[PDB]
Design a protein around this nucleic acid. Structure first.
Ligand SMILES: [Ca+2]
Length: 312
DNA sequence: GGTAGACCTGG
DNA sequence: CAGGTCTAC
């Protein structure tokens, strides 16, 4: 009973809650949607993963978000630990208000988003986010999730073990920048991405100023932030936009891939004006990204998540 | 200065 | 061929 992953019903006394109706957050819509790849629904409707360097299990009901953390001597989440969960889901950002704004300026959203409330962006760590998305090249959520999982098992610090699952924190810069890491990563199937992880871990640490550099980008402007990241090997416009949108607090960033194009040509009859190329291209993509930022406003990136979900 | 191609591996 | 990046035309 005191073993394995917990459930709200099995170990009641060890849970705490955060007021949050499903209209504000839908775990099943956000945790496996491809923002973070470290959450698993071990028990139905129960998600487990590493948040703030500790293992948590989250599950929601009516107007509550239930949290339980595995640090000894158990005990429900504390006032502050639960606060970390709040910052992670950026709950202070009200979706009810955003859906209202986007819906009032975009009829197609109005309809489409009705059946998909509770979609929002996670406030991730710049490192985990930088390296996870460097691995998303020529890949899908399932592939990426696997790679990222073996990567932490191999170089991340061992947290705690639940059932036959051992949790690891995301690798540090020192670890990814170490000797022979690229070779190690290739054995884990990362392919050519192995080079970028390693090259990028070294660049931040030996050419840019380390962790601080990355972090400091949360205070910089979207344009500065975007430019900075692109400096890294394996980090282009797309990955830079994801990192900006997902870890550096830039809600206006709008990552453009052939997917966003499909949603644009099918639900808006969008077409490139400036750039000549009709298919995706550096210039046409930038243009497409500007279209949505003009259409949805500052949180264009959050609106995109909503559509991607409903398009599933 | 904008556009094919290789880089790993597997569904 | 794939939710990308890098580089030689
Ligand atoms: Ca780059």
């Amino acid at each position: 009973s005191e073993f394995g992953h917990r459930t709200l019903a099995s170990t009641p006394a060890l849970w705490a809650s955060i007021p949050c109706p499903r209209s504000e957050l839908r775990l099943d819509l956000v945790l496996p949607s491809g923002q973070s790849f470290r959450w698993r629904e071990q028990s139905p409707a129960h998600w487990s993963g590493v948040l703030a360097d500790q293992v948590w299990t989250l599950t929601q009901t009516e107007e509550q978000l239930h949290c339980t953390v595995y640090r000894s001597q158990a005990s429900r989440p504390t006032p502050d630990e639960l606060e970390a969960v709040r910052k992670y889901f950026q709950l202070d950002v009200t979706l009810a208000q955003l859906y209202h704004h986007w819906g009032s300026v975009d009829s197609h959203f109005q309809e489409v988003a009705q059946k998909f409330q509770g979609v929002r962006l996670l406030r991730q760590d710049p490192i985990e986010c930088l390296f996870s998305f460097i691995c998303s090249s020529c890949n899908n959520i399932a592939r990426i999730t696997g790679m990222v999982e073996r990567l932490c098992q191999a170089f991340g610090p061992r947290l705690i073990q639940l059932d036959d699952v051992t949790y690891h924190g995301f690798p540090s810069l020192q670890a990814l920048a170490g000797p022979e890491v690229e070779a190690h990563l290739r054995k884990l199937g990362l392919g050519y991405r192995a080079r970028y992880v390693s090259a990028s871990a070294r660049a931040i640490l030996e050419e840019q100023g380390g962790l601080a550099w990355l972090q400091q980008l949360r205070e910089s402007s979207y344009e500065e932030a975007h430019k900075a990241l692109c400096i890294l090997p394996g980090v282009g416009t797309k990955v830079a936009d994801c990192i900006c949108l997902m870890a550096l607090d830039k809600p206006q960033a709008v990552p453009v891939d052939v997917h966003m194009w499909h949603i644009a040509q099918r639900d808006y009859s969008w077409h490139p004006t400036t750039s000549q190329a009709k298919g995706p291209s550096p210039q046409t993509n930038k243009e497409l990204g500007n279209f949505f930022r003009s259409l949805w406003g500052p949180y264009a990136g959050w609106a995109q998540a909503v559509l991607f979900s409903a398009d599933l």
